[PDB]
Write a protein that binds this DNA or RNA. Sequence first.
RNA 1: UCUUAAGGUAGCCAAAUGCCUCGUCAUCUAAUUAGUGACGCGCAUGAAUGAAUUAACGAGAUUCCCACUGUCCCUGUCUA
RNA 2: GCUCUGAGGACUGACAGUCGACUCAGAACUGGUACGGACAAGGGGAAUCCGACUGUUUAAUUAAAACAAAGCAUUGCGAUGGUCCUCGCGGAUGCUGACGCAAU
RNA 3: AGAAGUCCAUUGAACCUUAUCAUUUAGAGGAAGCAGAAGUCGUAACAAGGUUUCCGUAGGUGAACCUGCGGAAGGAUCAUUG
RNA 4: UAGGAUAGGGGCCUACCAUGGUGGUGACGGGUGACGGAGAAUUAGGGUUCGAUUCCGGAGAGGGAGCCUGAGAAACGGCUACCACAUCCAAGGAAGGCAGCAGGCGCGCAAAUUACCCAAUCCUGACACGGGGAGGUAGUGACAAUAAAUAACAAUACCGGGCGCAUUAGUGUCUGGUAAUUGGAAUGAGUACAAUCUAAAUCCCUUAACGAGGAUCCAUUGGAGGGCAAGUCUGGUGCCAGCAGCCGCGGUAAUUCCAGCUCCAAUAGCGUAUAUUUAAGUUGUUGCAGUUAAAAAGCUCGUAGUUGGACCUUGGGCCGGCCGGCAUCGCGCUCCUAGCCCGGCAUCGUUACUUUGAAGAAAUUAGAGUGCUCAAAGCAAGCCAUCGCUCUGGAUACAUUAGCAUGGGAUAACAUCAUAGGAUUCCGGUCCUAUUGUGUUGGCCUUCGGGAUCGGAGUAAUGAUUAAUAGGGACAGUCGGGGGCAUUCGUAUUUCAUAGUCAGAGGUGAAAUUCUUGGAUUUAUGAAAGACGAACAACUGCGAAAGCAUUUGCCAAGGAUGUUUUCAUUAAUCAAGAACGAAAGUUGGGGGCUCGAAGACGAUCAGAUACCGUCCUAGUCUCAACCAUAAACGAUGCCGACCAGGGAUCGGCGGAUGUUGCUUAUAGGACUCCGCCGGCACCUUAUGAGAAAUCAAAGUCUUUGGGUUCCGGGGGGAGUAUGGUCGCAAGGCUGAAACUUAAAGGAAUUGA
Lengths: 138, 150, 128
Amino acid sequence: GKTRGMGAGRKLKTHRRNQRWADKAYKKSHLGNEWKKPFAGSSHAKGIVLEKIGIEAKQPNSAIRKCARVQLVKNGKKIAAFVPNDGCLNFIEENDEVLIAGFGRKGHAVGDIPGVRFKVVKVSGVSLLALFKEKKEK
Amino acid sequence: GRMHSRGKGISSSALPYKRTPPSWVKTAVADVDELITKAAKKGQMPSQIGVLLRDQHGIPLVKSVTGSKILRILKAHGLAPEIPEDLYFLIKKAVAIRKHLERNRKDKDSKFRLILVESRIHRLARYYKRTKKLPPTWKYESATASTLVA
Amino acid sequence: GRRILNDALRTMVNAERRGKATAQLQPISGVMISFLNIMKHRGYIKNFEVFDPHRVGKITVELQGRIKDCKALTYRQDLRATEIEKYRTRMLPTRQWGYVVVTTPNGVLDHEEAIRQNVGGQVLGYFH
RNA sequence: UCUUAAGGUAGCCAAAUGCCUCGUCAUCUAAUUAGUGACGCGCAUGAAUGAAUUAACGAGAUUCCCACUGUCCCUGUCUA
RNA sequence: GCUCUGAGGACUGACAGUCGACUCAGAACUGGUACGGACAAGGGGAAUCCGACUGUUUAAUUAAAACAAAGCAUUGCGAUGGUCCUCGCGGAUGCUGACGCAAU
RNA sequence: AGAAGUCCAUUGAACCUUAUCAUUUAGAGGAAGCAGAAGUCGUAACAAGGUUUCCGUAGGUGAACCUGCGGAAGGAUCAUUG
RNA sequence: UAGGAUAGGGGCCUACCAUGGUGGUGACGGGUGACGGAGAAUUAGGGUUCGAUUCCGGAGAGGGAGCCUGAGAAACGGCUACCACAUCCAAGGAAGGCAGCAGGCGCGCAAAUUACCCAAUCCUGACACGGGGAGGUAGUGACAAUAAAUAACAAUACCGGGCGCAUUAGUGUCUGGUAAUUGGAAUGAGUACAAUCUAAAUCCCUUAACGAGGAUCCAUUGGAGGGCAAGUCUGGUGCCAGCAGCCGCGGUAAUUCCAGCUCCAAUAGCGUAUAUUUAAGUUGUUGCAGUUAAAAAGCUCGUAGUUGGACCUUGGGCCGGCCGGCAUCGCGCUCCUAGCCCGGCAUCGUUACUUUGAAGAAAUUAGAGUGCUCAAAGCAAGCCAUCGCUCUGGAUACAUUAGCAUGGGAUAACAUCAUAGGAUUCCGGUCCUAUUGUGUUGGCCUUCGGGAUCGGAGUAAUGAUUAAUAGGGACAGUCGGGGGCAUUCGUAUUUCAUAGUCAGAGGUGAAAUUCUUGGAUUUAUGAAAGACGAACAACUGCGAAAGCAUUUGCCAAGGAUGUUUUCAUUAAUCAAGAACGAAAGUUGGGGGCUCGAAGACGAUCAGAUACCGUCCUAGUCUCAACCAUAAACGAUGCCGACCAGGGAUCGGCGGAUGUUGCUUAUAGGACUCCGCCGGCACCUUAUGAGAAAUCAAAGUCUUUGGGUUCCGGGGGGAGUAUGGUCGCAAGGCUGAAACUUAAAGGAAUUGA
Ligand SMILES: [Mg+2]
Ligand SMILES: [Mg+2]
Ligand SMILES: [Mg+2]
Ligand SMILES: [Mg+2]
Ligand SMILES: [Mg+2]
Ligand SMILES: [Mg+2]
Ligand SMILES: [Mg+2]
Ligand SMILES: [Mg+2]
Ligand SMILES: [Mg+2]
Ligand SMILES: [Mg+2]
Ligand SMILES: [Mg+2]
Ligand SMILES: [Mg+2]
Ligand SMILES: [Mg+2]
Ligand SMILES: [Mg+2]
Ligand SMILES: [Mg+2]
Ligand SMILES: [Mg+2]
Ligand SMILES: [Mg+2]
Ligand SMILES: [Mg+2]
Ligand SMILES: [Mg+2]
Ligand SMILES: [Mg+2]
Ligand SMILES: [Mg+2]
Ligand SMILES: [Mg+2]
Ligand SMILES: [Mg+2]
Ligand SMILES: [Mg+2]
Ligand SMILES: [Mg+2]
Ligand SMILES: [Mg+2]
Ligand SMILES: [Mg+2]
Ligand SMILES: [Mg+2]
Ligand SMILES: [Mg+2]
Ligand SMILES: [Mg+2]
Ligand SMILES: [Mg+2]
Ligand SMILES: [Mg+2]
Ligand SMILES: [Mg+2]
Ligand SMILES: [Mg+2]
Ligand SMILES: [Mg+2]
Ligand SMILES: [Mg+2]
Ligand SMILES: [Mg+2]
Ligand SMILES: [Mg+2]
Ligand SMILES: [Mg+2]
Ligand SMILES: [Mg+2]
Ligand SMILES: [Mg+2]
Ligand SMILES: [Mg+2]
Ligand SMILES: [Mg+2]
Ligand SMILES: [Mg+2]
Ligand SMILES: [Mg+2]
Ligand SMILES: [Mg+2]
Ligand SMILES: [Mg+2]
Ligand SMILES: [Mg+2]
Ligand SMILES: [Mg+2]
Ligand SMILES: [Mg+2]
Ligand SMILES: [Mg+2]
Ligand SMILES: [Mg+2]
Ligand SMILES: [Mg+2]
Ligand SMILES: [Mg+2]
Ligand SMILES: [Mg+2]
Ligand SMILES: [Mg+2]
Ligand SMILES: [Mg+2]
């Protein structure tokens, strides 16, 4: 069972130190590889669109999920970003500045979409919701 | 249970409630000291002397009749064994096992039993050096141990 | 492989849970006896009787069916007379009955006596 | 499916073994029929006809690099 | 180069005396930066092929990648035998005998 | 008094060669895992899954696998005085 | 050790000398998107995470370095040099340093004005006066935080529940509301005099005249299948477009998309992303798990670490209202506190633990007082005749550890009475230091004051807990398929030899390969070889496990039982380290019956590299050395206690008469019954536990603490890559990540 002796503090403190590495949440934030992820620990990121693509939805569903390959300015990274509304891919062009956010679930793929974990949130400095809601034109 | 086995037997002695000797022990405390002293000068160890008294001379317990433990009776007379009785008997056994192996080196069970004996010898010598019943430099040497005993 | 006052107190609970009339405690000690005095003066056990054949010695306790649980806190903490309150809540059924026995330089006693005499000490067990 | 006594196994390769052949890809170069690493429908590799490796060693064959220099640009001069 | 400093010994009656051939460390000074001053005396590295290595070889055109080798394996033979020589007589292995001899 | 200069020491930037370390990054060719798809070959497993399954080791074969040796029941037997 | 230097200690530096210093209690080295603290977020408690930033400490001024002056600097709004970057040049030269304030570029998801002033707080100088991009004031500012509008009241109402008649009625009560219905009242958002404000301005707070019909002085952001509050509405689409954190929605009747309507939640705010906290008892000290869900190391030894039986009066009480102060059979006091012969004395073992205090920066936290109009705040203010002043406040607490001081002395550590070198009231000698008799200065000494040694008489109750249902060791008779060495045997099989007889035999679901008148198979006698050890043989034994069954002898070892023997805590478990470890496999020899991976054939089959059949290589067996793995399993670590009933059984011992193919007689041996101890198990049952299957140990668990070791944290990737290390090799040990995915899985139920 557990070690309980009054002078066992060194054994107990060490053991929790070893065993915390077996917790995925701990090791994820303490191993260093979050800085090797494309965003490098940022909430949003600016990018430039390389092309408009569109990706198939996973088996139970059947749709064309429309995305864009954008290239990250800070580190040259290339990622695929979902354009999340009805017909909102039209507002997106090629060689246009774009603001990329997380898509949810903290770097894990979301919904039926295979392999996409970024969403486009701004284009040309105009809110993408604002474009889908006509408030501000680009 | 056992230190070097899995047996948990409780076979042992049960000394009575009465510290004093039974009424019929009509010896003299000086006279029995001669009985202990003669047995030692005959080379017998304390554990065997107590058996002798109990079996021929009808002494149930020495601590009752004399008030003193046997080894302390010997020690006051300058007859206490140099290596304690129990340590000696282990050292005798490990010597016996090593001689048997030096003809049977594929007796892997006897090699196992050897390791247990020196583990027992060294744990006990750790104790006796601490309480100064052995010289602080006394060392159990595998080779030069058959000379010490027997 | 012995650490007594666990063997004593667990024997009483197991005897009590079954509903027996008496319990025997093979190793005894002054610490164990002083714990039974505290239990008895508070009314959770009847009298008890020491056995001297020589040895650690034996004690037989007469149980009155109204001890609910008695435990030992091995790994005996130091206990200022200030955190009495926090060990009280964690270990006792309520703020009304139950006692934590603490060994203190004015003797073994329950946490109630400890506050009055303003002494802290090292926890031994509890009963309720 | 025809056939054989058996149909070349593990391995190895344009190898001191490949005609085509200056094979194709990469590397070394300013430029490489040379070299090394790969590829393998192997004219015509292959297991004591020993197969594949291999530290140390070699007046053994080959490629490159640093240093060195009358080998050379380009000859001149001195001694016997 | 020069001028020094220290260490490392012997014998004789923790000392005193005398003697002592040799090595190594260190410093200052000095020069037209010379100093293993002539002599003597490795160029080095990254790789491929062959042969493991040492050894040997075509005297007088070939020194090797050829031969040998340790290691590995096969074969014959128990003596009235195997392998071999001899015109014959007879002989070698054999002053031997399977951990041996003989043939690859 | 005393400058320029100069001499020897000391601190010492800085530059260069070799080495080493660490972090990135290219590469013929080789080779893993994942996922997708309305593909080809079989039928290994789940029932005694049609040869009971499985573990270690070893060898062999298009593939799942097969076979030897020892082991396990997580077996298809809690059972022979019948 | 001696120097030198410094303001000064010091290998700080120098010469000579010695060989030390640190390290599993983690040295050294690496990472840090690392200045430290005061603190911050979250918080049932315990915690987890953050801390560049206004206070304190440190460090730096593009990177290094060296300096001058000065009390103070290795200063950069000082210098000198170099490195990098760059400005001017009349081309010879010259001048540099915004991590100060503002501002520009760049970089990025990511941040304000090139404003006014020394009026406040303070600082500075020769100074009452100068200066201060300290600092303050204003513009930008939905970072956070506070208070708080967007209507209130009335009657009409087609109406709507009760309540007065309750019947039959009807309306009328709180107005609940479509109501651009109607009626006047209230008011600030706004705007504007003035005054105030202020260093001067502006804003606030006061406040002349304007400032409301609901279309306006109009509130938004997310949702409406579930989780989760709110549509079985209507049009469009038709696995498209889309939504969807998750589960899911969409294939022509969509509660989920796109829209209108209506509703729901919060509300001057709300959504999204990312890190972190909670939820998470999914990191478990409090407080998790390891039979089958992830997880007991194959097994034992062992150092460190962790843990460790009992026992030594404060026991029996006088005393005054929890406690002093005390007598019992309370080791001293000269020296300080020292009562009217007297309490309450200091050194001749150390600590943790607790008690109280000190001294602890403030700001922040908690918390008292105080009506800033409330609140977040602030540290003020309140009464007087809210009249020549009165009364003031500006509390207090927590502060883990380490250090200092005080009492306690239960618990728990380390050290230590048995060579008595122990305590002890006195006794002179080995000996030195000299004080009141040296009114002065001293300086050897007679009784005399202490070292310190020291020989002897002295006194005393003269000084060693017990023997753990802890452990070791001894001894006695046993027990066992425990081990090693040598050895006796048994049939079977294969081969051989001898003899007999004559057509088949072998194998199979059925056959075929194969053997056979050179006589196969079968039968019989003998021989050789090598493996194997039937039956007996079990819900039996021994062993740490792996494992261990023919006989006998030899060698050493072991458990249990028995014991009024002995030691006396010597122990439990264990990083590092060590012994053993089935089968297979490896290197050499030996042997090579049987079986038999590989291979070769005959069948089967769609095929058959398989099952079936035939032949056979390594192997099977042994000696030497390797290897170190198994479903190495009880899928259950070891030590200890408690807990339920029973009959078997194995080993020992104890107790009973009665019986033998025994035994010179009993006694013992075989058998029957009873008891104890120790083993391998089994059965029946919960009052127990568990998800259950099940389990008398998987029990004594939210009423959670006996000790200790190993190990798990959704499924995969993967026991993979890489580095290390061990091995001849095969491989063993250690052992990720990128990425992917909503389940995988366990027990039990009904069906098929
Ligand atoms: Mg988690
Ligand atoms: Mg026991
Ligand atoms: Mg042990
Ligand atoms: Mg081939
Ligand atoms: Mg080729
Ligand atoms: Mg060339
Ligand atoms: Mg090539
Ligand atoms: Mg050929
Ligand atoms: Mg050929
Ligand atoms: Mg050939
Ligand atoms: Mg050569
Ligand atoms: Mg020299
Ligand atoms: Mg050669
Ligand atoms: Mg020649
Ligand atoms: Mg030649
Ligand atoms: Mg040759
Ligand atoms: Mg001959
Ligand atoms: Mg099948
Ligand atoms: Mg099957
Ligand atoms: Mg099965
Ligand atoms: Mg096969
Ligand atoms: Mg000095
Ligand atoms: Mg930093
Ligand atoms: Mg920073
Ligand atoms: Mg700068
Ligand atoms: Mg500075
Ligand atoms: Mg400076
Ligand atoms: Mg500046
Ligand atoms: Mg600035
Ligand atoms: Mg809406
Ligand atoms: Mg919506
Ligand atoms: Mg919902
Ligand atoms: Mg609902
Ligand atoms: Mg969403
Ligand atoms: Mg799904
Ligand atoms: Mg919905
Ligand atoms: Mg809608
Ligand atoms: Mg869990
Ligand atoms: Mg499992
Ligand atoms: Mg186990
Ligand atoms: Mg230890
Ligand atoms: Mg302390
Ligand atoms: Mg005992
Ligand atoms: Mg015995
Ligand atoms: Mg016949
Ligand atoms: Mg038996
Ligand atoms: Mg037999
Ligand atoms: Mg075959
Ligand atoms: Mg294993
Ligand atoms: Mg296991
Ligand atoms: Mg137990
Ligand atoms: Mg019996
Ligand atoms: Mg029994
Ligand atoms: Mg987890
Ligand atoms: Mg996992
Ligand atoms: Mg499983
Ligand atoms: Mg299942």
